[PDB]
Amino acid sequence: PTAYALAISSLGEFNSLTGGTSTDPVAEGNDYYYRFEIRAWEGSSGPQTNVTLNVTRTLGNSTFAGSGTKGVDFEVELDPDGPFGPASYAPVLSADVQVLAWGPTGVQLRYLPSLAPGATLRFSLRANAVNTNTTVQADATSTEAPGPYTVFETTTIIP
């Protein structure tokens, strides 16, 4: 019925869209990136459709950066077998992500392909550190899954 499940997780902040290392705190006037995962339950009755991430600023003054360019302002990677297999994260084709909304205070991304049971998506989002704490709410949903699934991640910004 429900018979499909999804999960969301925060991975915290990084100083690069992909690779690099962790950050937080962040000095005002520097870029940083939030990373979030959406994970399809390995037991799901088939692939999931319209897998959507909605991120919104709830506290503080940092802003999502740029105009919404894939490979600079955001990245979406697929781990095709999730934690259950040795395949790694690789960026999807530009064709496979729709920017529903890109603004300094809110970003919405939808994955157009269907998401295999067990597979995971990694979303990286560029932000402008502006002083104090920034917190964002991340919501994950799909058509088939009883969403939303919600986390809050928080970044300390040095004035």
Q: Residues annotated as binding site for Ca(2+)?
A: 8-9, 13, 24, 79, 81-82, 85, 87, 153-154
Q: Is 139 in the site for Ca ion (CB under 5 A)?
A: no
Give the interface segment with its own copies, choosing from 3-11, 45-53, 61-69, 94-102 (CB under 8 A): 3-11
Choose the one of its own copies, Ca ion, none that binds residue 87, judging by a C-beta under 5 to 8 angstroms depending on kind: Ca ion
CA dihedral 6, 123, 23, 154 (to 10 degrees): -50
| Amino acid present at 66 | G
Q: Is 9 in the site for Ca ion (CB under 5 A)?
A: yes
Among 87, 90, 93, 158, binds Ca ion (CB under 5 A): 87
Contacts with its own copies in 69-128 (CB under 8 A)?
82-83, 120
b/e burial code for range 96-124 (CB count within 10 A of at least 16 → b): ebeeeebeeebbbbbbebbbbbbbbbbbb
How many C-beta neighbours within 10 Å does residue 68 have? Answer: 18
Burial of 92 (0-12, 13-18, 19+ CB in 10 A): middle
Applying CB under 8 A, the residues found at the interface with its own copies are 5-13, 15, 21-25, 27, 37, 39, 41, 43, 82-83, 120, 132-133, 135, 146, 149-156, 158
